[PDB]
Structures are given as C-alpha cells and as structure tokens.
Subunit: 114 residues, 3 copies
C-alpha cells in the first residue's frame, strides 16, 4: 500500500518516528505486511482548505484491495487521528482519496502484481 | 473538492491571492461551497512537457460528482484561462486530470463522505 | 501521457537528460508522439518503503488508453530499469500506479480530449 500526505505544516513540526508510525499503523489496519507499505510525507506546502491557510492535509491511500466503505471509514479515523495527534491538524481540514488498485495496474520489481 | 497544480514556474511568479482566486473560481464553476474546496500549488518543479521545459503544468481536480463531459470542458477553459493569465503558462502545455470520486472513497473528519 | 516520479534520492543524483530520456522512452513505449508526453521528477522527498529510508520511488503513469496487463508489465520493466540505471534505486523499492484515463476526464488547451 501507499499513503501520501501533503501538508502546509512545516517540516520541523513533523516528528522523528512519524514515517515508522504511519508504516506500522497502516500495516495493522490494512493487514498488508509492513514490507509492502510506502509512506510519503510532504511538509511546507503551499495549500489552502476552504479559503484559509490554517494547518491542513491532502492525502491519498492506494491499495490492492482492502478498500471499501467500512474499511475507508476506519482508515480515516486512524489517519485523521495521527494527523491530529502528531501534526496538530484538525480532522475537518483533512481530505483523503482512497484508491482500490487492480493488481495489473501496479508496477513493482520490473513487473506488476498481476 | 481537491485541486492540485504542479508547475515548473517559480514560487515568486505565483501571485498573492492565487489560492483565493482558485478557491473562489472552482466554487462558482462546480457549485461546491468555497469552505470545502482545498487547493494546492507546487511551483519550482523539475518537469517537461513535450520534451521542453518552457512553462507548463499538470493539474488534478478530485470531486464527488460535478465531473462530466461538459463540466470538465468548462473547467479546463476556466483553469487554463487562470493558469495563462496569472502564471503565464500556455494552455497547450497544461494537462488536467478530472477524477469523479465515490463518497465512500473520500475521507474527511474522522469518517468518509458516505 | 504523464509520468511522475517522487523519490528520496537527492536533486544532484538526477543526471542531466533524465527528463528528456523519460520523454523519449515513454514516447516509444506508449506509442505517442513526444509532443504529448509530460514528465515530472520530484527528488529529496521525505519517504519510506517497507519502513526503510534506503533509496525508493513512487511513480504514476496516466494515459488515455495504452494501459493494460501486458503493457503495464512492459512499462514497469522499462521504467524500473531507468530508475535503477540512472538513480541507483533498487527495482523492489519502486511502486508505479497506472491509470487509464477517459478522454473526457483529461483537460488540455482550454478543452478536454473527449
Ligand atoms: O479528494 C477529494 C474528493 C472529493 C471531495 N469533495 C468534497 C465535497 C463536498 C464537500 C462539502 C459539500 C457541501 C455542500 C455541497 C457539496 C459538498 N461537496 N465534494 N467532493 C473532496 C476531496
């Protein structure tokens, strides 16, 4: 799986240990082993949410399965949670895009997962 | 909705109020309220369009509904217009990807839209 | 077509010509004239793959058609090769998402491809 965060929060306010935490928490929630999880944090970004430049987050989670209504509800509770706890962003200023990828449309190790 | 502009144009060339104007303009066009539109500009990027590194842009608009043939056509006139006027980028060096999101696949405020 | 790669490899590890080379190789592979190919490389990124900060990369390829099982396998082999040969990234630390875009959902030059 693949989680990307884009946030107007400056790099300094991102803790050490944050990528490891995202990695272990997403592994636990998706059931995918940590070895297959990728995280990408993008601080210091030039973004607004609803006209205002208070702290915010634009994110995405791509996964081959383990995507759907109840799972996405759960994932968003877990992620908004970490973004609030660790980056002090308020959940109503977070948007997450969820992608259920087909194995044929994901490339890895010179080939695809199909 | 979620709007991102990646561009090779440098930061100093992005006018102040560009985010505001995008927020306000995407609101009118989509019919979505300004307060839920989130915008994101990424300037000073290493990119090429057509082999060339003359000014160019790659955008994306994610949205639950309001994504369709005529709407997208309307949005592209609107967003190219703005990119040309304010960033001095030629429209024929702009790609916009439109994504119509299912509500269950968009997280916000500890849950999803579904 | 549109190729984006984000990597925690430094700006200086990216050799000159890389964008041009991607543009050309993607023109051949996609069967599209380079006039329509856009590439975008994002070095220095804060990211992790399998919870490790060794070199890695997260890419995507967006195209109106030209996306499918046998083709994606061929893209991956081509693109993982360029990312190994030019950025010293191990192919088992590259993920590439492929997206088959509908003409109507891609904007360019004040309009859509529809
Ligand atoms: O990445 C995404 C995808 C979709 C959206 N999205 C938000 C909304 C939304 C939010 C609030 C609204 C309030 C009134 C009417 C429509 C509204 N639509 N629609 N699409 C946001 C981020």
């Amino acid at each position: 799986p693949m989680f990307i965060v884009n946030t107007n929060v400056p790099r300094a306010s991102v803790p050490d240990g944050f990528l490891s935490e995202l990695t272990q928490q997403l592994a636990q929630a998706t059931g995918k082993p940590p070895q297959y999880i990728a995280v990408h944090v993008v601080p210091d970004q030039l973004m607004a949410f609803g006209g205002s430049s208070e702290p915010c987050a634009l994110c995405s989670l791509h996964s081959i399965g383990k995507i759907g209504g109840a799972q996405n509800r759960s994932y968003s509770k877990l992620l908004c949670g970490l973004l609030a706890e660790r980056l002090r962003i308020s959940p109503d200023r977070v948007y997450i895009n969820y992608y259920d990828m087909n194995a044929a449309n994901v490339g890895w190790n010179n080939s695809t997962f199909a």
